[model samples]
Structures are given as C-alpha cells and as structure tokens.
Target chain A: PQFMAAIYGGVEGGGTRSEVLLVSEDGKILAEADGLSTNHWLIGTDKCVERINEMVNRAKRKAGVDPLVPLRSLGLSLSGGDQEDAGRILIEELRDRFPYLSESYLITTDAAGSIATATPDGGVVLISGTGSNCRLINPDGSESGCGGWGHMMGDEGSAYWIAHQAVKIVFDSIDNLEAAPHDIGYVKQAMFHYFQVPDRLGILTHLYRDFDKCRFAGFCRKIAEGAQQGDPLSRYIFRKAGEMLGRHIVAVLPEIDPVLFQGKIGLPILCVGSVWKSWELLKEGFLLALTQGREIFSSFTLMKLRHSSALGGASLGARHIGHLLPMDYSANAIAFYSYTFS
Target chain B: PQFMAAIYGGVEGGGTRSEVLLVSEDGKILAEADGLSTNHWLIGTDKCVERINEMVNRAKRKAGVDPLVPLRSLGLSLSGGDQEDAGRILIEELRDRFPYLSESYLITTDAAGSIATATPDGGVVLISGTGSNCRLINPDGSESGCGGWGHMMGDEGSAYWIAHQAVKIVFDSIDNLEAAPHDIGYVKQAMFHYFQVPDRLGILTHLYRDFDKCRFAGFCRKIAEGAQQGDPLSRYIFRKAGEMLGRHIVAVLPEIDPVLFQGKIGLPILCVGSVWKSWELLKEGFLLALTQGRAQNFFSSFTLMKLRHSSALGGASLGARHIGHLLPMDYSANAIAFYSYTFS
Candidate 1:
C-alpha cells in the first residue's frame, strides 16, 4: 500500500471516438490518451467497458501510477451516457471487471460535462459541424435542447443543411424560370464533376442509393470557398445558415433562467464545432436574426473552450468528492463574437 | 391446315407490374393477362423475357389461339424502354428464344404507346399517378418532355410530390414563427397514426430504413380527405399541386405542333392516371397558373380528354400499325373535358 496523491480520471466519450484524461489535485495535466468510441448503444456494454479499462490504464501508466492502484475518482461523460438505466449497466460492468481503475465514479452525457468546463453555472451550448445540436442548461441543473434532431428531421444551420441548400439552388436554376438557368456557373458544374457523374439523372444516384451523409456534408467547404470568392448563391445560402442558427438560440431563449444572464458581459454561449471559424460569413445574418424579435437579448457573447472537454469530465468527479478543481476560465475561453444592442 | 386469323399482341409494361393484351385486326379485344415488371433495370433482361413469354402465352390460351401459331405483330411499350441500343438486344433475346411468338415486334416507351390510344395524330399526354411524367409528341413524330425526373430529383406534381409537400408544410409551420403551429389539425395527426408512430424521430425510420414509396405516396389520400373537409392547409397543398401541373403544360405548350390544334377544337391533352378524379379541387389553381406567364395563349386553347381504355389498347394499335396493317383508331370511347380559359 502506497500513499495516493489524488489523481482524477475523466472520459469525454463520443460517438465517433473518445478521450481519456488524468489530472492532479493542483490542476496540472497528468495524461491524455485518445481511443475509439465508448458509446454503449453503438458498440455494446462490453466493448465500452473494455475500451474504458484499457484507456484509463494507459492514462495511469503515463502518469506513473502503478496499474494496480485505485484512482481517487473517475468521471465518464459519454455521447449517450444520459440513458440512466443503460449507463447503470455500463458502470456496474466496469466495477466488476476493473474495480481498481477508480475508487468511485460519475456518469453523464458529453454536453452536461463539457458545460462544466465553461461555467459551474449552466448556459447554452451551440454545436455546429457536419451536423448541429443546441443544448440549453439551467442553473438549477435542469436541461433542455433544441435542433439536435439529425439531418432527416432538421439539422438546421448544419454543414449538411448548407450543402443541401447549395444543391437545391442548382436545381431551382435549372428547373424554375427567371432563376437564370442559362447563367449557371462553377457551383453547379463543380457538383457534377465532384460526384464524377454527368447530369441530373447521374447525380441522383449519389443522393439516394449511394448516400453518404458525411461525404455529402464535406461539400460545404467548396461552397464556403465559393462564398469567399464572390458567388451570390453560395453567399446567400451561408447567410441563410446564420439566420437559422440565430433562430436556434431564440427558440429556447424564453426558457433560460433570468439569473444566468447577469454573471458576464452578457449571457454566455458555448459555441462548439469547426463551422464557427467562418464567423465573418455567418455574422451578418446571425446578428440580423437576434435583432428581429422583441429585443430580449440586449447582449450576448459566442465563446469557444480553449481546453479539451475531457478535462471537464475530471471536474465532475472532483466535485462529487467535495473538492472543486481549479480552472482558468478567462484564459481558457475565447470570446469570438460579443454583441450588445446600442 | 388450319387458317389463322391475325391476332396482334401488345404490352403496357410498367415499373410496378405489366399488362399483356391480344386483340384482333378489327378493334376487338380478345384476351388480357397481367404479369410482373418488364423493367430490365429492376429485374434482368432474362427475367423480363421469361415473364413476357409466360404472360403472352397465358393471354393466347385465354383467347383460344393455338400455341404454335405466331402473333401477327407485338408492341412492347415498357418503362425505361427508350434506350434504343439496349432495347435492340432485348428484342433480339425475345426473338431468339421464342421465334414463333410474333412475326415482328416494335419496342418503345409506355408514354409513346399510351398516347396512340387517344389520338392517331401525336398530342400531349399528362400522366399524374403515384409519380408524374408529362410527354409531348409533335405531329411530325418529334418528342419533348417536361417533368418526369422521378422522386429523388423532381416528379413535381406527383402524388409523392404532394405527400412530400404536405410533410414539409408541417415542418415549416412547426419550426417557423407565427404560422399558427397550434392550428395544426387532422393531417398532422393522421400522419402520426398512418405511420404507426408517435413522433418525428420514430417516423423517420420508415422514411430512411423501411422506406416504401407507395405507402408514403398513399398518405396523399389522407390529405385529400382533409381537404374534402374544411381544412385550409390540405386545400392549400392540393391547390399548389394544381399550379405545378398547370406549369407542366405551359412548359411544353409552345412546342406542340401547330396543326394538332386545328384538327380538334383545341390541342389534344390525353389525361391519364387516378389523380384526375379530383379535377374540381384542382380547377382553381390549374386555371390560375395558366394565366400567369406572358399571355402564351393569345387565348387559352387545349382539349383535356380522359382516356376510357387502358394504355394496352394503344399498345395494340401501335402493333397494328407497325405491321403496316393500316387499322383505324376509334376515339368514340374517349371523354372530353373541353374548356377555353375565361375569367369570371
């Protein structure tokens, strides 16, 4: 038996992949190891346990802790971890197989844990990548979400939605009158060569039979470049995406707790995903939408976390153990867009 | 030796199923049999040939024609039948295997054969069923088309199009502000019950995984019932479909042969398929769209006639002519819904 230095283990489990992290009581990073998904629904309870065991052991090994020593605490914030009954099975299985990996543990979803990394108080998290999901968290720990529905239902303001809009623009020009069918340009022709198919009939095969939502979404980059190079249709779609994103925020703005709006320059918005990089493209419509309504939002800031979400997992377990992990909120959070009504 | 009376064979081959008809030289219907699809794209050419052979023999047996005696001529009007080079090989296989089936066979599209049943002279055929395809034939034997891009692309005024448009109406009204989301009525709830699901997420599975285009398109009937009652949204969707179909005609009206309009009171519009039964519901939007674009018609002119016989009749007529038999087509059975555009 050796003295335990209180190392905290955390997992930000995702559908596609996962991250395992180890940190010390003093808030210095100890270890981080990337692994495959720990999503129990996609890979089964057994696979989730197996990968978690190996990943935590790897993190401990790098931190110089013996494989047999129990971690002070472990936190699991997975993609679908909120399914309480299913998650209970996952935690029980982990204990049965590797009890020494963690002395105690906590389980929740990626959104719940990542929000901790931003503020102890809850706020809205807007994620827009290949797909989009907007989650709003109340200060009392209750939560609600908007626009997390996948592409089929509505992933408004997502890359796939933008890409789909670009395609429809081409169709409208070709089929509808006065849309200048004869004046079609690079975006329409690029779509043909992009799919390696000739015309309307040939490209349809990709949309249905050989459908790939991921690769289809990746086409948004070409449109983004088209907007960058001055294309009216491309720019129009990007602007539309911004308007929808702003609507997403307004959709649940009435429900957010009134108190959380006071703690900062304005209400804190945790903006996640790669699409935020092109703020200039989205800025015009986004700001335009916020100004459209009854003027509830006088000011708000869109922010990105400078730290990995996996670190937030460490804090969840640390909090349960009655110790708050030290966090550098000011330095770790970048304010990309801060707006106040004049 | 038995003297044989000439019997002509014809097929209105479809994507879903097919119809085989055997008729006499004098416009007398002898036998009819049903079979599976002749779409070589869906099933192989060999399977298409086998079904045709069996179906033709079944019709022949029903007609009391001897199995050894050859049909005078056969016309195959199939979906996806327009691929001339590919169609040539299909005909070659039919002849090579069943040399005694027919003396000669002419292959073409269902639209081409169906158009022949209404007018010996070529005219516009507006077909709107589960899916819609509008084919225009000039009297000079030249052809052009407006909307038949299938569901993935367009099928603009089709049943599937109408059904899909209604689904979007729910989404649009739900997501947008001030469309009266609370005003959603029977159509939305019927969609939930019809799919056997409670919410959007559950219903999406049937759309992507267990997708049945026919069942999805059939949901249009529920919306039609909704319109039959006093629901504003359902009526709005049906009216929109009318606008689309009207545009379908105007899109090709300028290109129709000038002479076809002179032969009849107006140009012949051979209306086909089940959707035409609700014309009164569609009349408002249809007439509205006709008057939209630049007065294409110095005045409105077109005879919308309903086909009283199956497309198989035209298929037989096509075979009758292909063998150079010079048979006259009778339009006495056709019903005309004749009208010229006039504002009240």
Candidate 2:
C-alpha cells in the first residue's frame, strides 16, 4: 500500500455523540474515532475542542502516523454548523487548535460532506442525522437548505420533533381518557429513554430545559421505527417531514444551475441521513412531494474517514498548495483502504 | 295586577329546552304548560315528555284553571325542534299532555321565545346556554344559526370547547415543562376535580371518554374562568374560542335582516349563557365576534327565566296563554286566575 494517506473524515458532532473517521490517500481508512458529540450547545465549547483533539490524536496513533507531521489533507463536516456563523466558529476552533499542522482543514456544513460522499456530481443532500438539514448544492456552488431551523422553530423530521410529537400524543390520550395509541406511544417510550427522563413529565421538563436538537434526530429514527410498525400517526409525521425536506430541496433546485433542469441535462438528487435509513418510504414520499422534472437517487454507504476531520483539513491544505487530489481510484482499493484504518 | 294569572313552564329537553306560555282568554292570564324540547338527539323524546307533563300540571293548578276544562289555546316553542322528526315528537307530546287544550299551538325553535322576550320583533338569538346555539329569526319567517354542533365536532364558543381548549393548553404546558410560567395550576386542579382523575393518565382517560357531549360544556366554563384570572395560555384559548364563535355568527349575516343591528328594523341579537356573566373581556370578545349587521342584547329581563330549562318552560307557558286568550278574556276568566300556586 502506498504510504500516502487518502483520508475522508465525516464528523457528526451532534448534541449527544460525535463520530469521527480516518481514511487512506487511496480511499483506505487507517483509523476511526467516535465520541460524545462535543457540540458546545450540549457540552461547553472548550470541552468540545478537547474531545476533538483527543479523538484526532488517537486516530493518528492508530494509523501509525507521526503526531507532529501534517497529514496529506482532511475533510471535516459538522452537524451544528448549519448557519454560516456556526461554520465560522467551527473553523476558528479548528485553526486555534492545530496551528502547526501542515495538513489542510476544511470546515463546511455536514450536508456538504454528505453530499460529496453520496453524489460525486453534487446534488441535494438530505441530512437527517442528529438534526435534520436538507441542502441542495449545485455544480455551480450555489446552495439552499430547509428544515434545519433548530428545535425551537423547526426540524420537522428530526428526532426532537419526533419526541415532541410522541409526548403530545400521550398527553392527548390522557386528555381524552383513552390509552396512548400505538402510533405515538411506541416512539414515546424510545424518546423517554433517549433523553433519560424519569417519567412523562420528566421527559417534558428535560425537553423544555435545553431543547437538545440531536436527541430530536434520534426521536425521528424512533418515529421511523414506529411507522414501520404500522403506527399511522408516526408514519404520517415522517411522511410529512420527508415531504417538507423535499419541498426545501425542490425550492433550491432551480438556483443550482437552473440550466441543468432546462430540458436537456437531467439533475440528480442525493439523500443522506440516519432517518434516510428508512429511505424506502422516505424516498417515495420525497419523490411524491417534489415537483416534476427532478430525479432522485438515494444511496447508503459506510463512511470511514480517519481522525476527527483531519482528512478534510488535509484536503483543504492540499488545495491551498494548488495540487488537486486524484478524483478516481479503484473501487476495490477504495473499499480495502477505507476499512483498513476504520 | 288585576288578579291576572300567568303560567310559565320550562322543559329541559335533552338537545334543547322549551318554554311555553298560557294566559286568560281576555288577556288576563291562565294555566300554562311547557313541553320538553323535541331535540331528541340531545334529550330524548321520552324524558322531555315526562318533564312537560310535570310542568303543565303544576302550572294548571297555579293559574286556578280546571284540568278538565278546554283552554282557549296553547303556544309552545322548543329550541331543538328544527329537525322535522323532533318537531313532530314535541307536537305529539303537547297534544297527549294537554288533551283539553286546542291543537292550535304555535310550534317553533326555542329562539322564538327568546326573540319575542328580548326584542319585540324576532331577530338574532344567540343562546350560549348549556350547549350554545345561535339563531337569527326574521319577521319574514326565514332564519339563520351559528354554533350548536355539540362537543365532538362544533360548539366553538360553547363551554365544552372552552374547557377542551383549556385542557389542551395545560397538557401541552405540562409536557413542555412550561407549566411554571402560567396559571394553569388552577386549571389542573379544576380538571382533576372535574374529571375525578388522579393523574395525567387518569385525566386523559376522562377527556376522550366516549365523547359525552353535554358534560363537557360545564368543563369548558371552568377553563374560561381560568383564562379570565390571568392565565395567558388559557386566556389565549378563550379568546380564540370566542373568535371561532364569532366567525360562526359572521357566516349568517348575509341574508338576515338587521333591524336590531341598526336599531332600525329587526330585533336585536340575544346573547345567552354565563359567558355574559363572566369577565368583561369574554363578553367583549363575544361582542366583537358578532357580525356587523347584528346588535348585541344581553339576557337581562329574561335572567329570571334562566334556571334549569324547566323554569323557562313555566315562563313560556305564561307568555303563550297571554297571547292566546286576548280575543276572549271573559271566556277564559276561570283559567286565568290559577297561576300563583307555590309548586305551580
């Protein structure tokens, strides 16, 4: 194997857990790290920086790379970095932490990386992970997103919404003097445990306390599971949530090179999200909600990137150096190398 | 004042209540009896009939009218008699109960008496009683109504909807941990008592319990009171509920004549129920909710007649006979003096 490392790091810095990865230069992963999503919103920013550094160091050692030497490049993406200001803060944190590293560091929205990983040509990426965000990126660099409005205002298909929906249903049942119906109760139990609330009120208090956005994403998954179990209300909420995401995607499709949809070139849509694991139904709903003329291709793949976004940082550094990495590699080699470090 | 006798009877039928009037042939006064409302879907026909008899017999003796003697005529208007079947049931019960009385009874919705008592000319009558129903009766025989769908579907400004909205807000607050800010603690206490439930689960069980429409109306009043006492959420709900009721009234404004609205032609709109008795804010909300062409008239003089539908029935009996016996006061003199008896 070439000593050159091709690292593709996917950092899901959520309210609860943060996942990190390290991959070889030839699409091989030499090491990977997962930890509590040290998002300052959930945990303090200082702690967040510390955890990221720790994860990155651990991955570097596992990959048998010198801690002092700069990696080839790094591709880092985050969950809470939905807005531009958030993105800037994240970048500042990265710059402040590793000033001596020669590797490039790229701090972008998690949607961007998910899009890059799923669609090589750049398309709509529906990231329904810890928080739900749907971004439509064109080849021309223009982008627009929807439904990642955080827990207070929005994030319909995210876990927070799902959990809230569950609690509401339970309350409704109590009000009507009936048992909490299966549609919401199933998901309600999962959300109760996910937040670690003692009882129904405890769950509500915790939600009202901080309004954790990532926990909401997990709630969305539980809702998806409930929907699969034939809970009509849960299914309807997810279906509606997916449709909302789709509406946002379609809204931005025109700006992403309106010419692409102009009768000749066909534009493709890509989806990325833990919620998208229920893509069988979400895709159908997404397609149904989309206005005609747009094509959607949904795929699921394990992303093994070494270090905590070290590869994304390295990739940006390489770009700064003016040498673009190879865009093509053997599928077999990419798979073997991606997992070796993972 | 002239030893005149007036009989008033109220029959609290299931869906609607009835008030009937009976007086002397010479317009002095006489025996009166109110039949149960025939709105069978609400209060069944059988129960209404039973109540009607009890009221009629009681009024007959009070007016000093002979039970066996044929009276000049009878007048009965029921609130829930809009449906043909209900009307028929009410008519049948009236004939069976007062065999001696002529069948020339003027059957109408309960709103007719309310209009006659409130406004000289029949106009819009907004009855916010138990279930809440609004009716606009023009002199030309046409009518329009808003609300009164019962708890399951409609009854927006009605007490039941008010209570339901209050409960919903409280539950939502508890779930969101936003209970600390609002005065919903009062609501929770009232709800616990109203539903007789111990906890949240018990409370919920009572809310959806088979959709018992009428009982929910009382529950709604409690919520409205809570809103009045500074519960922003509850107040918002009451305001919203009033707004909804207002919207329903607005829907009927197009075709109806508006003399009461202009103090020009038709009678004024009669606003009933304790909603008027509660906070000025709620009344203001109701007043604002009214349509442009309708004038607001509170149930003032008629307040005495607002007891359990039975009293309204007794009042209706007095009013009806007074109208019926005007042509031949001498002929019905004996029946005119019997109305002051205690249980009458």
Write candidate 2's Cα lDDT for A1-342 as tens digits.
424544444454544566665665555556777776655434544666667667776777777776575555555566544434445665577667775332455555566655555334545555565556667777677765554544433455655655566656665453332245454556656656666865543443334323445644455666777788887777777666667655655555445665444332234444444555665556546656564324531222222222233334333334544545433321211110111110
Q: Estimate each model's TM-score.
A: 0.74, 0.44
- Model 2 preserves the real interface contacts to a fraction of 0.00
First chain of candidate 2, TM-score: 0.72
Candidate 1 C-alpha RMSD relative to the actual structure:
6.7
Model 1 steric clash pairs:
none
TM-score of 2: 0.44
- Provide the lDDT at A117 for model 1: 74
Q: Candidate 2 docking category?
A: incorrect
Residue-wise lDDT of candidate 1 within A231-341, one digit each (tens)? 877778788889888888777777789886775668878887667777788889888887885374558988998877778888898987987888776755778778887
